[PDB]
Design a protein around this ligand. Sequence first.
Ligand SMILES: CCN1/C(=C/C(C)=O)Sc2ccc(O)cc21
Length: 343
Amino acid sequence: KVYNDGYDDDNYDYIVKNGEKWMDRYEIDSLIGKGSFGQVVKAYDRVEQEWVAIKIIKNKKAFLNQAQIEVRLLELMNKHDTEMKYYIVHLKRHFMFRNHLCLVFEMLSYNLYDLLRNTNFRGVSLNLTRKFAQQMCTALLFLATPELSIIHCDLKPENILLCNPKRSAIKIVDFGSSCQLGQRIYQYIQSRFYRSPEVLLGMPYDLAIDMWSLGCILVEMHTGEPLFSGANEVDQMNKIVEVLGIPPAHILDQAPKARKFFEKLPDGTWNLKKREYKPPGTRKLHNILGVETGGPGGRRAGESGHTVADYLKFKDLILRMLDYDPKTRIQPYYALQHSFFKK
Ligand SMILES: CCN1/C(=C/C(C)=O)Sc2ccc(O)cc21
């Protein structure tokens, strides 16, 4: 047996061959991304004389349809005048090639997870974390513009890439798992480590879940490690609880999956259901960040911009993003006005 006249493997993926040239225009260099959607290759565009990243979607309706949605969102975004739009990876064009939908993007650099790996998971300085945070908030502010109302829904280190390995500018990629505010067609969403409490609880979600993800991400960028690394959903909620405490009863009283993690005592209050975890709220963010001890592992003692004052501004902003209540979790516009960003 052979697939798609020999162009595809048995998993609907296009068999990538280095040096092959398509439509007398693109010269495929190499594979730079794999996914359930298909692949992402680096390629040289002979016509525009530039490197581009091409996302080759699997030759399968399920995937083709999911990608057409990403194309519409991207086209919808790029057609918006503001310069906040230069925080979203740019879709140059798309076309069908050998039965595969292809999205041509501008070529980017390393993703923030690779960045953390190049530090041996020790983290980057607070000053660079600040630059990333500022851009991320602007991007979220952008996605929040009414006509868009886009919920990225899968923010994580891997989906944030450096524009150039030298500069600190970033762009968010992968809008294949995205969606606009609406009905809840699906519930299991976001990468586990960055999954917001509302999602874990089975409650209605909106753009606020991206902000939760961002808060988890900023802490990871600076300490080098995932703030909440659950092996499964129960383990995940417990780790969130160690740091933030038991969620407010008003939220847990409406949480369809509340009893998956908590139990309501005869007096109406909620407790963890169950030395695996520190007591609720005892794993203080103040200490994870090392606010008064020279940062994570004290490896920042003495660095410019790593004063107790600087760290206090960073802790406050993170705590406003990790607000259990999505109604009062800080929004993009205000996060941007936070003193962590003031000069
Ligand atoms: C994995 C890398 N990656 C993308 C992944 C997805 C899922 O869309 S998209 C994209 C665009 C430019 C680039 O340089 C890398 C890149």
